[PDB]
Amino acid sequence: KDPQEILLNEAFVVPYGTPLSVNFGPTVDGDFLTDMPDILLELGQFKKTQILVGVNKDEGTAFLVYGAPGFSKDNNSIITRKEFQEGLKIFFPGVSEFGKESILFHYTDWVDDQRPENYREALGDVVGDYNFICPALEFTKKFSEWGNNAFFYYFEHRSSKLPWPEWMGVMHGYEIEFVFGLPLERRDQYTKAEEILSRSIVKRWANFAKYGNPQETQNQSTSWPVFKSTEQKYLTLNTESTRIMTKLRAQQCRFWTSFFPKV
Amino acid sequence: KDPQEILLNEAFVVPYGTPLSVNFGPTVDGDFLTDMPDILLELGQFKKTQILVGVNKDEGTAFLVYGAPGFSKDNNSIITRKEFQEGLKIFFPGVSEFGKESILFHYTDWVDDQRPENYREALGDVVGDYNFICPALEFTKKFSEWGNNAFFYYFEHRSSKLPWPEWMGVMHGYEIEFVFGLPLERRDQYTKAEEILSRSIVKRWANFAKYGNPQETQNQSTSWPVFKSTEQKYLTLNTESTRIMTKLRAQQCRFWTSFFPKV
Amino acid sequence: KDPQEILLNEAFVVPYGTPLSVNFGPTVDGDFLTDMPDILLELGQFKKTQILVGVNKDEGTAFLVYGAPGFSKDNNSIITRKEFQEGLKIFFPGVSEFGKESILFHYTDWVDDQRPENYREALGDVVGDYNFICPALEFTKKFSEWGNNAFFYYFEHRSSKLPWPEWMGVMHGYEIEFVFGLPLERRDQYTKAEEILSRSIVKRWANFAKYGNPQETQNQSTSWPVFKSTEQKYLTLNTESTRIMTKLRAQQCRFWTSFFPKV
Ligand SMILES: *[C@@H]1O[C@H](CO[C@H]2O[C@@H](C)[C@@H](O)[C@@H](O)[C@@H]2O)[C@@H](O[C@@H]2O[C@H](CO)[C@@H](O)[C@H](O)[C@H]2NC(C)=O)[C@H](O)[C@H]1NC(C)=O
Ligand SMILES: *[C@@H]1O[C@H](CO[C@H]2O[C@@H](C)[C@@H](O)[C@@H](O)[C@@H]2O)[C@@H](O[C@@H]2O[C@H](CO)[C@@H](O)[C@H](O)[C@H]2NC(C)=O)[C@H](O)[C@H]1NC(C)=O
Ligand SMILES: *[C@@H]1O[C@H](CO[C@H]2O[C@@H](C)[C@@H](O)[C@@H](O)[C@@H]2O)[C@@H](O[C@@H]2O[C@H](CO)[C@@H](O)[C@H](O)[C@H]2NC(C)=O)[C@H](O)[C@H]1NC(C)=O
Ligand SMILES: *[C@H]1O[C@H](CO[C@H]2O[C@@H](C)[C@@H](O)[C@@H](O)[C@@H]2O)[C@@H](O[C@@H]2O[C@H](CO)[C@@H](O)[C@H](O)[C@H]2NC(C)=O)[C@H](O)[C@H]1NC(C)=O
Ligand SMILES: *[C@H]1O[C@H](CO[C@H]2O[C@@H](C)[C@@H](O)[C@@H](O)[C@@H]2O)[C@@H](O[C@@H]2O[C@H](CO)[C@@H](O)[C@H](O)[C@H]2NC(C)=O)[C@H](O)[C@H]1NC(C)=O
Ligand SMILES: *[C@H]1O[C@H](CO[C@H]2O[C@@H](C)[C@@H](O)[C@@H](O)[C@@H]2O)[C@@H](O[C@@H]2O[C@H](CO)[C@@H](O)[C@H](O)[C@H]2NC(C)=O)[C@H](O)[C@H]1NC(C)=O
Ligand SMILES: *[C@@H]1O[C@H](CO)[C@@H](O)[C@H](O)[C@H]1NC(C)=O
Ligand SMILES: *[C@@H]1O[C@H](CO)[C@@H](O)[C@H](O)[C@H]1NC(C)=O
Ligand SMILES: *[C@@H]1O[C@H](CO)[C@@H](O)[C@H](O)[C@H]1NC(C)=O
Ligand SMILES: [Br-]
Ligand SMILES: [Br-]
Ligand SMILES: [Br-]
Ligand SMILES: [Ca+2]
Ligand SMILES: [Ca+2]
Ligand SMILES: [Ca+2]
Ligand SMILES: [Ca+2]
Ligand SMILES: [Ca+2]
Ligand SMILES: [Ca+2]
Ligand SMILES: [Ca+2]
Ligand SMILES: [Ca+2]
Ligand SMILES: [Ca+2]
Ligand SMILES: [Cl-]
Ligand SMILES: [Cl-]
Ligand SMILES: [Cl-]
Ligand code: NA
Ligand code: NA
Ligand code: NA
Ligand code: NA
């Protein structure tokens, strides 16, 4: 077959995809992957070494404008309860009615003013928590339980140059330019605070690679504590002030991690 | 003397006051107070019981519009370095030139964009840290070292009704209406999120008084941890989400607490 | 170039030197030294082995007679406040006025009789603490935090043969002859107590080299405890009686180590 015919049919190998569909991805092949990877993680079968793991404050927003009803990069996407409900059907197509209601129940207890953006924000958090943030924290816990140092970050800076609208916040993929040091180029119109945030992340990443410890030792920076089971300390990355926090998304991730897999 | 003549002369009993002057206040009288109170605190001579202690995010701002040059409730008070320097002279009149420079040095290392509000914000933090926040945290540490449970809060909600301008932020005195439950009165035009914040603070205060433990046990609230030496956990009070944090103003309070008293 | 022309111009490659100038010294070359050495120390990137570290009681005095005003090997060098101030300008040429005042402030709070030698002694301690003693103790702490045994000494014996005047005390470089065992030669006019001090130091050094433990095991000597973070025990070397002490120069080194680098 022409490579085009293979590409043109990839989308259709599944009866219904979502904006998050991975139609052709890693499998347990008995070669690269010897067993179901959840089993290897749980039972400590992996390379013993240090890890650095993190997520962005609004992981799920990018996906909402690829098909969730009432969303748009070109307006504020204030959506209704009905739209939220439709959006779950878009993101959780094989899931039972009870499964989808349990998501609605966990995410729509406000908190409290009404707050036209309530449903818009909840849908981004559903998608970001389920797909990115809770699995990263779960991976980090299970990995650290076998004795290795782990460092966890929560990136919460929105790029001053971001072409996506404000409501989408600190999107998926938008720490990358900070990690590769693009704001170090003064010719590029990033702010001065961003040049500093990038320089510091660049140094922490490089110190991690060289020394297994993502500290910035020279500028009176906040010390990055290891992420342990029990305390679960993480470092926030922002332009203002680095903070040590604990138990990112504790209540949300209990939902996705212990209850949702049963549904 | 007529009480008016006493009142009219009170301001002048001091060669130079500041907006923070307490001309006639508590003294060591050998009766109510048997010794210098710093000595009693340090050496554990006080009632052994639980305490609840807290401060507001912008304690020092209220005082700046009573005489610091370039400040005004009726504009944004963007002040210069020269004005900041003059402002220290207004707030630290008996203090040596070196003392005042040490304050300038500790507070003016930015952090980094310039940031026209840099000096305005620093002066509010100088006043709030020196006068309210570091002494409260120091009191809380020394008190808890003698074995009693202590709970510390950082109030960071600006009242939607605040008549003072925005730059003054979460001012001194403006948690009080939340503590006395004024936002519980729906007729009063506080937001719904404020009614909820107040109800929860009212419950924590009442639980503290009745049970020595300022928890809100029924609504899945963040648990308020005791403030201990070493970890120094505190609870943030805000309309969005209560957080447990550590070592409020660590770098600033090291300055005021260990170095400034020598100057 | 003739080697003489290179030598003759070395002094001038810098706009102002001090008696402590190292115009051509180690650099981070990417070969011998792979990174800034403060970063390697802090992040534990060094050979894991035992160390023996020490300093002399008056490290800074030797340097004062190479240019500090009012100092002389040929009189008692009783200097004034003005001379002390001038001396800081000689030793801290690139340093801000505030930086130099902070040194004056930390070192001139007496303690208390006046004490004509006050300023003379303070200037020697400024130079010795900044340049030798606090960096050695800081090196020893950071090295020991990674698990290796460290032993720290404070040499406080003035050689009976010292050609420098008394006020200079236990100078920089004047333990060396004790370490190489020159006082073991009875023909040399060192005292008997010095022969014994040298014999014991020679044995401790040799036991350190052979066995990693600088004990003198046969003569009822004071046991030399490992220097740990937290307790910071060190051994004094003197002709009278060896003592175990703690936290050499604690107050001074807090100044140089945590505050001065900011200035
Ligand atoms: C934000 O826009 C959406 C997305 O679709 C629209 O893009 C707009 C910027 C505009 O060009 C519009 O014409 C275009 O269709 C709006 O939702 C859409 O609105 C109609 C009804 O008016 C629905 O029937 C559409 O199906 C729906 N599209 C999708 C993909 O849901 C949305 O209402 C708007 N929100 C605002 C203005 O707050
Ligand atoms: C904010 O206002 C201050 C405070 O004083 C002023 O109040 C203003 C709202 C206005 O009515 C003004 O006329 C009144 O005096 C301004 O600082 C003042 O400005 C003058 C020079 O223009 C100084 O000589 C005054 O001494 C000074 N007063 C004080 C108490 O410092 C301030 O500049 C202004 N800031 C702005 C607009 O950003
Ligand atoms: C200790 O001596 C110094 C150093 O300079 C001097 O050495 C002396 C032993 C003597 O030979 C003297 O003539 C020689 O200059 C004295 O300080 C010097 O004194 C003069 C003023 O009298 C100053 O103008 C010099 O600049 C100054 N030299 C330096 C390098 O500072 C010092 O006063 C003396 N102290 C005593 C006796 O207590
Ligand atoms: C995997 O196998 C079948 C295959 O059905 C598919 O045929 C493909 C070639 C492709 O075009 C795809 O879109 C189509 O869905 C799946 O069966 C589907 O299930 C529905 C009901 O859900 C039935 O109507 C059909 O058999 C078929 N769908 C359509 C629209 O024709 C089957 O769901 C899947 N197995 C899984 C997901 O585990
Ligand atoms: C306490 O005692 C004196 C008293 O001086 C004061 O006289 C009062 C009745 C009152 O009006 C007050 O404003 C006035 O200051 C203080 O002496 C002052 O110090 C200055 C120099 O700082 C001198 O000029 C005067 O003696 C006097 N000031 C003025 C403006 O006339 C003294 O400072 C104080 N003691 C303290 C603060 O410890
Ligand atoms: C490194 O570069 C310049 C070089 O200046 C020097 O020229 C040398 C060849 C040598 O003779 C040396 O003594 C001379 O200082 C330094 O510039 C100096 O700074 C001063 C002001 O501080 C200026 O007047 C001159 O450019 C020069 N000094 C003199 C006396 O002529 C520069 O300071 C230095 N860079 C550093 C220290 O980081
Ligand atoms: C540290 O601070 C300097 C000067 O204050 C700054 O220019 C540099 O970017 C900083 N280095 C890192 C790694 O953040
Ligand atoms: C707890 O929740 C209820 C109902 O959800 C609410 O009305 C009440 O204000 C809350 N009580 C406290 C003490 O916060
Ligand atoms: C130990 O003591 C002996 C005899 O009392 C003495 O001569 C010798 O110098 C000492 N040895 C050491 C290593 O100090
Ligand atoms: Br419904
Ligand atoms: Br200045
Ligand atoms: Br002076
Ligand atoms: Ca958040
Ligand atoms: Ca992407
Ligand atoms: Ca930092
Ligand atoms: Ca703050
Ligand atoms: Ca008030
Ligand atoms: Ca809560
Ligand atoms: Ca001494
Ligand atoms: Ca020498
Ligand atoms: Ca001995
Ligand atoms: Cl916690
Ligand atoms: Cl912490
Ligand atoms: Cl001790
Ligand atoms: Na609703
Ligand atoms: Na500036
Ligand atoms: Na200081
Ligand atoms: Na004096």
Side-chain angles (χ1 to χ4, degrees):
Chain A
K1 300 316 275 191
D2 288 338
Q4 255 326 279
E5 202 180 326
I6 283 155
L7 293 166
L8 273 22
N9 289 107
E10 284 183 354
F12 312 106
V13 307
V14 128
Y16 38 62
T18 80
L20 281 101
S21 281
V22 167
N23 281 166
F24 288 97
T27 37
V28 182
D29 58 351
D31 186 358
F32 188 93
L33 247 188
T34 70
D35 198 346
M36 300 173 62
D38 45 298
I39 305 180
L40 303 173
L41 186 50
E42 169 71 22
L43 295 183
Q45 304 301 121
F46 44 79
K47 181 187 177 58
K48 299 316 183 283
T49 190
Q50 304 72 37
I51 53 167
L52 189 174
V53 185
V55 293
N56 295 357
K57 169 182 180 172
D58 306 278
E59 290 292 356
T61 57
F63 308 92
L64 307 176
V65 297
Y66 293 85
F71 285 89
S72 173
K73 73 169 192 65
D74 297 306
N75 68 32
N76 65 9
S77 292
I78 290 299
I79 54 138
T80 63
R81 186 172 174 80
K82 253 189 188 184
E83 283 163 328
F84 181 84
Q85 280 170 324
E86 297 300 290
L88 296 180
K89 182 166 324 157
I90 294 271
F91 285 93
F92 299 85
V95 173
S96 68
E97 288 324 293
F98 167 78
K100 296 185 261 259
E101 267 244 278
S102 81
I103 296 171
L104 169 305
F105 177 90
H106 195 263
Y107 275 85
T108 54
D109 211 305
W110 355 90
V111 104
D112 197 327
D113 255 317
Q114 259 61 118
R115 279 207 106 253
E117 51 287 297
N118 275 349
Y119 286 111
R120 184 196 78 196
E121 306 218 316
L123 193 61
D125 290 317
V126 166
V127 172
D129 293 345
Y130 170 58
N131 289 289
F132 298 93
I133 303 187
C134 306
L137 283 154
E138 175 83 341
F139 178 86
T140 308
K141 317 192 190 182
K142 294 288 182 186
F143 196 97
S144 75
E145 268 158 18
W146 285 92
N148 283 104
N149 280 359
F151 297 93
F152 194 98
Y153 68 85
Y154 183 59
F155 183 86
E156 76 200 346
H157 178 70
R158 183 169 155 105
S159 170
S160 60
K161 301 180 65 187
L162 202 83
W164 301 95
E166 272 164 61
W167 71 255
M168 300 188 51
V170 183
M171 289 172 61
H172 182 79
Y174 286 92
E175 88 291 350
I176 297 170
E177 61 204 82
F178 287 77
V179 169
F180 280 84
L182 311 211
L184 309 172
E185 178 74 83
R186 201 179 85 240
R187 285 148 154 337
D188 244 39
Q189 264 71 8
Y190 291 96
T191 62
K192 181 90 208 176
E194 279 175 332
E195 175 192 353
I196 299 296
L197 174 56
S198 182
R199 177 76 198 85
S200 167
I201 287 170
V202 165
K203 171 61 73 185
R204 295 183 180 277
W205 262 235
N207 280 350
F208 184 70
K210 303 180 181 145
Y211 310 127
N213 207 340
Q215 309 306 330
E216 184 302 303
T217 64
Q218 308 175 304
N219 288 0
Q220 330 293 335
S221 305
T222 305
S223 217
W224 193 339
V226 319
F227 181 106
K228 263 164 165 146
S229 253
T230 88
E231 296 182 291
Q232 297 158 239
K233 294 180 194 183
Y234 60 104
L235 180 69
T236 68
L237 298 176
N238 63 74
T239 236
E240 345 158 291
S241 67
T242 300
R243 282 157 185 329
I244 300 317
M245 302 300 270
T246 51
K247 292 169 182 199
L248 180 60
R249 299 279 200 286
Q251 268 218 150
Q252 299 91 152
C253 292
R254 288 189 229 114
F255 170 77
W256 285 116
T257 306
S258 326
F259 173 69
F260 197 68
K262 300 153 158 101
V263 128
Chain B
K1 300 316 275 191
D2 288 338
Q4 255 326 279
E5 202 180 326
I6 283 155
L7 293 166
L8 273 22
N9 289 107
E10 284 183 354
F12 312 106
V13 307
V14 128
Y16 38 62
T18 80
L20 281 101
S21 281
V22 167
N23 281 166
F24 288 97
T27 37
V28 182
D29 58 351
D31 186 358
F32 188 93
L33 247 188
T34 70
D35 198 346
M36 300 173 62
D38 45 298
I39 305 180
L40 303 173
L41 186 50
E42 169 71 22
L43 295 183
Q45 304 301 121
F46 44 79
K47 181 187 177 58
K48 299 316 183 283
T49 190
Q50 304 72 37
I51 53 167
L52 189 174
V53 185
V55 293
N56 295 357
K57 169 182 180 172
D58 306 278
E59 290 292 356
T61 57
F63 308 92
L64 307 176
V65 297
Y66 293 85
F71 285 89
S72 173
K73 73 169 192 65
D74 297 306
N75 68 32
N76 65 9
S77 292
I78 290 299
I79 54 138
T80 63
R81 186 172 173 80
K82 253 189 188 184
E83 283 163 328
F84 181 84
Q85 280 170 324
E86 297 300 290
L88 296 180
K89 182 166 324 157
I90 294 271
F91 285 93
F92 299 85
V95 173
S96 68
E97 288 324 293
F98 167 78
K100 296 185 261 259
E101 267 244 278
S102 81
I103 296 171
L104 169 305
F105 177 90
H106 195 263
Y107 275 85
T108 54
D109 211 305
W110 355 90
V111 104
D112 197 327
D113 255 317
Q114 259 61 118
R115 279 207 106 253
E117 51 287 297
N118 275 349
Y119 286 111
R120 184 196 78 196
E121 306 218 316
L123 193 61
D125 290 317
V126 166
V127 172
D129 293 345
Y130 170 58
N131 289 289
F132 298 93
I133 303 187
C134 306
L137 283 154
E138 175 83 341
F139 178 86
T140 308
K141 317 192 190 182
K142 294 288 182 186
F143 196 97
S144 75
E145 268 158 18
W146 285 92
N148 283 104
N149 280 359
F151 297 93
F152 194 98
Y153 68 85
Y154 183 59
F155 183 86
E156 76 200 346
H157 178 70
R158 183 169 155 105
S159 170
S160 60
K161 301 180 65 187
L162 202 83
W164 301 95
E166 272 164 61
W167 71 255
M168 300 188 51
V170 183
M171 289 172 61
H172 182 79
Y174 286 92
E175 88 291 350
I176 297 170
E177 61 204 82
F178 287 77
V179 169
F180 280 84
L182 311 211
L184 309 172
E185 178 74 83
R186 201 179 85 240
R187 285 148 154 337
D188 244 39
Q189 264 71 8
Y190 291 96
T191 62
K192 181 90 208 176
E194 279 175 332
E195 175 192 353
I196 299 296
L197 174 56
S198 182
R199 177 76 198 85
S200 167
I201 287 170
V202 165
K203 171 61 73 185
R204 295 183 180 277
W205 262 235
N207 280 350
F208 184 70
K210 303 180 181 145
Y211 310 127
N213 207 340
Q215 309 306 330
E216 184 302 303
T217 64
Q218 308 175 304
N219 288 0
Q220 330 293 335
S221 305
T222 305
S223 217
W224 193 339
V226 319
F227 181 106
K228 263 164 165 146
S229 253
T230 88
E231 296 182 291
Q232 297 158 239
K233 294 180 194 183
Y234 60 104
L235 180 69
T236 68
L237 298 176
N238 63 74
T239 236
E240 345 158 291
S241 67
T242 300
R243 282 157 185 329
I244 300 317
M245 302 300 270
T246 51
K247 292 169 182 199
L248 180 60
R249 299 279 200 286
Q251 268 218 150
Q252 299 91 152
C253 292
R254 288 189 229 114
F255 170 77
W256 285 116
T257 306
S258 326
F259 173 69
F260 197 68
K262 300 153 158 101
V263 128
Chain C
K1 300 316 275 191
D2 288 338
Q4 255 326 279
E5 202 180 326
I6 283 155
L7 293 166
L8 273 22
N9 289 107
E10 284 183 354
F12 312 106
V13 307
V14 128
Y16 38 62
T18 80
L20 281 101
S21 281
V22 167
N23 281 166
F24 288 97
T27 37
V28 182
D29 58 351
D31 186 358
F32 188 93
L33 247 188
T34 70
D35 198 346
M36 300 173 62
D38 45 298
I39 305 180
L40 303 173
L41 186 50
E42 169 71 22
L43 295 183
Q45 304 301 121
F46 44 79
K47 181 187 177 58
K48 299 316 183 283
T49 190
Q50 304 72 37
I51 53 167
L52 189 174
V53 185
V55 293
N56 295 357
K57 169 182 180 172
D58 306 278
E59 290 292 356
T61 57
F63 308 92
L64 307 176
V65 297
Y66 293 85
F71 285 89
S72 173
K73 73 169 192 65
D74 297 306
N75 68 32
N76 65 9
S77 292
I78 290 299
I79 54 138
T80 63
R81 186 172 173 80
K82 253 189 188 184
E83 283 163 328
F84 181 84
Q85 280 170 324
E86 297 300 290
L88 296 180
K89 182 166 324 157
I90 294 271
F91 285 93
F92 299 85
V95 173
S96 68
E97 288 324 293
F98 167 78
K100 296 185 261 259
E101 267 244 278
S102 81
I103 296 171
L104 169 305
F105 177 90
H106 195 263
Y107 275 85
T108 54
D109 211 305
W110 355 90
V111 104
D112 197 327
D113 255 317
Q114 259 61 118
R115 279 207 106 253
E117 51 287 297
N118 275 349
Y119 286 111
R120 184 196 78 196
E121 306 218 316
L123 193 61
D125 290 317
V126 166
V127 172
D129 293 345
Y130 170 58
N131 289 289
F132 298 93
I133 303 187
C134 306
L137 283 154
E138 175 83 341
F139 178 86
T140 308
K141 317 192 190 182
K142 294 288 182 186
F143 196 97
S144 75
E145 268 158 18
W146 285 92
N148 283 104
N149 280 359
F151 297 93
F152 194 98
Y153 68 85
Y154 183 59
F155 183 86
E156 76 200 346
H157 178 70
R158 183 169 155 105
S159 170
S160 60
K161 301 180 65 187
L162 202 83
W164 301 95
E166 272 164 61
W167 71 255
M168 300 188 51
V170 183
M171 289 172 61
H172 182 79
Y174 286 92
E175 88 291 350
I176 297 170
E177 61 204 82
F178 287 77
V179 169
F180 280 84
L182 311 211
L184 309 172
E185 178 74 83
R186 201 179 85 240
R187 285 148 154 337
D188 244 39
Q189 264 71 8
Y190 291 96
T191 62
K192 181 90 208 176
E194 279 175 332
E195 175 192 353
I196 299 296
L197 174 56
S198 182
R199 177 76 198 85
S200 167
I201 287 170
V202 165
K203 171 61 73 185
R204 295 183 180 277
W205 262 235
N207 280 350
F208 184 70
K210 303 180 181 145
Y211 310 127
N213 207 340
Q215 309 306 330
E216 184 302 303
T217 64
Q218 308 175 304
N219 288 0
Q220 330 293 335
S221 305
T222 305
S223 217
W224 193 339
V226 319
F227 181 106
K228 263 164 165 146
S229 253
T230 88
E231 296 182 291
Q232 297 158 239
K233 294 180 194 183
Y234 60 104
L235 180 69
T236 68
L237 298 176
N238 63 74
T239 236
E240 345 158 291
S241 67
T242 300
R243 282 157 185 329
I244 300 317
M245 302 300 270
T246 51
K247 292 169 182 199
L248 180 60
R249 299 279 200 286
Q251 268 218 150
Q252 299 91 152
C253 292
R254 288 189 229 114
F255 170 77
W256 285 116
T257 306
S258 326
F259 173 69
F260 197 68
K262 300 153 158 101
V263 128

mmCIF file of all heavy atoms in Angstrom, chain B residues 11-16, ligand 5:
data_model
loop_
_atom_site.group_PDB
_atom_site.id
_atom_site.type_symbol
_atom_site.label_atom_id
_atom_site.label_comp_id
_atom_site.label_asym_id
_atom_site.label_seq_id
_atom_site.Cartn_x
_atom_site.Cartn_y
_atom_site.Cartn_z
ATOM 1 N N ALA B 11 0.320 63.242 71.266
ATOM 2 C CA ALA B 11 1.068 62.994 70.031
ATOM 3 C C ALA B 11 2.509 63.500 70.177
ATOM 4 O O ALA B 11 3.478 62.908 69.674
ATOM 5 C CB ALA B 11 0.361 63.659 68.825
ATOM 6 N N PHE B 12 2.649 64.552 70.962
ATOM 7 C CA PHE B 12 3.912 65.223 71.107
ATOM 8 C C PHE B 12 4.851 64.719 72.202
ATOM 9 O O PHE B 12 5.920 65.281 72.333
ATOM 10 C CB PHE B 12 3.652 66.714 71.236
ATOM 11 C CG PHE B 12 2.728 67.219 70.197
ATOM 12 C CD1 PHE B 12 1.430 67.536 70.517
ATOM 13 C CD2 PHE B 12 3.147 67.294 68.871
ATOM 14 C CE1 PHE B 12 0.550 67.963 69.545
ATOM 15 C CE2 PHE B 12 2.284 67.718 67.877
ATOM 16 C CZ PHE B 12 0.972 68.058 68.215
ATOM 17 N N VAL B 13 4.497 63.669 72.955
ATOM 18 C CA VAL B 13 5.375 63.206 74.055
ATOM 19 C C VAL B 13 6.656 62.523 73.543
ATOM 20 O O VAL B 13 7.572 62.184 74.295
ATOM 21 C CB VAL B 13 4.607 62.341 75.094
ATOM 22 C CG1 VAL B 13 3.375 63.101 75.579
ATOM 23 C CG2 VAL B 13 4.137 60.941 74.479
ATOM 24 N N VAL B 14 6.722 62.359 72.237
ATOM 25 C CA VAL B 14 7.771 61.627 71.527
ATOM 26 C C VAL B 14 8.401 62.667 70.533
ATOM 27 O O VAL B 14 7.664 63.505 69.962
ATOM 28 C CB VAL B 14 7.078 60.430 70.787
ATOM 29 C CG1 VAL B 14 7.437 60.376 69.334
ATOM 30 C CG2 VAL B 14 7.315 59.075 71.502
ATOM 31 N N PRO B 15 9.737 62.624 70.311
ATOM 32 C CA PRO B 15 10.319 63.630 69.368
ATOM 33 C C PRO B 15 9.922 63.432 67.889
ATOM 34 O O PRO B 15 9.865 64.402 67.135
ATOM 35 C CB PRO B 15 11.843 63.504 69.559
ATOM 36 C CG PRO B 15 12.059 62.112 70.229
ATOM 37 C CD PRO B 15 10.709 61.592 70.742
ATOM 38 N N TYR B 16 9.647 62.191 67.490
ATOM 39 C CA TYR B 16 9.172 61.925 66.130
ATOM 40 C C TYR B 16 8.361 60.638 66.132
ATOM 41 O O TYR B 16 8.870 59.567 66.468
ATOM 42 C CB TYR B 16 10.350 61.807 65.134
ATOM 43 C CG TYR B 16 11.545 61.104 65.731
ATOM 44 C CD1 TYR B 16 11.440 59.763 66.154
ATOM 45 C CD2 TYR B 16 12.784 61.785 65.928
ATOM 46 C CE1 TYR B 16 12.514 59.073 66.724
ATOM 47 C CE2 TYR B 16 13.894 61.095 66.498
ATOM 48 C CZ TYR B 16 13.730 59.725 66.896
ATOM 49 O OH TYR B 16 14.740 58.992 67.477
HETATM 50 C C1 LIG D 5 12.507 62.339 75.695
HETATM 51 O O1 LIG D 5 12.801 63.615 76.245
HETATM 52 C C2 LIG D 5 13.145 64.736 75.424
HETATM 53 C C3 LIG D 5 12.009 65.754 75.476
HETATM 54 O O2 LIG D 5 11.957 66.553 74.299
HETATM 55 C C4 LIG D 5 10.581 66.853 73.970
HETATM 56 O O3 LIG D 5 9.916 67.820 74.769
HETATM 57 C C5 LIG D 5 8.594 67.334 74.873
HETATM 58 C C6 LIG D 5 7.829 68.031 76.002
HETATM 59 C C7 LIG D 5 7.904 67.237 73.469
HETATM 60 O O4 LIG D 5 7.342 68.455 73.015
HETATM 61 C C8 LIG D 5 8.807 66.659 72.349
HETATM 62 O O5 LIG D 5 8.361 66.882 71.010
HETATM 63 C C9 LIG D 5 10.247 67.131 72.500
HETATM 64 O O6 LIG D 5 10.995 66.377 71.574
HETATM 65 C C10 LIG D 5 13.570 64.402 73.989
HETATM 66 O O7 LIG D 5 14.432 65.451 73.519
HETATM 67 C C11 LIG D 5 14.229 65.927 72.155
HETATM 68 O O8 LIG D 5 15.366 65.560 71.375
HETATM 69 C C12 LIG D 5 15.811 66.583 70.469
HETATM 70 C C13 LIG D 5 16.902 66.041 69.545
HETATM 71 O O9 LIG D 5 16.433 64.770 69.134
HETATM 72 C C14 LIG D 5 16.152 67.936 71.162
HETATM 73 O O10 LIG D 5 16.088 68.971 70.184
HETATM 74 C C15 LIG D 5 15.165 68.273 72.309
HETATM 75 O O11 LIG D 5 15.679 68.015 73.615
HETATM 76 C C16 LIG D 5 13.888 67.460 72.067
HETATM 77 N N1 LIG D 5 13.253 67.849 70.767
HETATM 78 C C17 LIG D 5 12.733 69.020 70.282
HETATM 79 C C18 LIG D 5 12.217 68.936 68.868
HETATM 80 O O12 LIG D 5 12.636 70.108 70.875
HETATM 81 C C19 LIG D 5 14.260 63.035 73.943
HETATM 82 O O13 LIG D 5 14.572 62.760 72.590
HETATM 83 C C20 LIG D 5 13.364 61.926 74.498
HETATM 84 N N2 LIG D 5 14.016 60.673 74.888
HETATM 85 C C21 LIG D 5 13.940 59.520 74.177
HETATM 86 C C22 LIG D 5 13.196 59.545 72.853
HETATM 87 O O14 LIG D 5 14.468 58.455 74.558
#
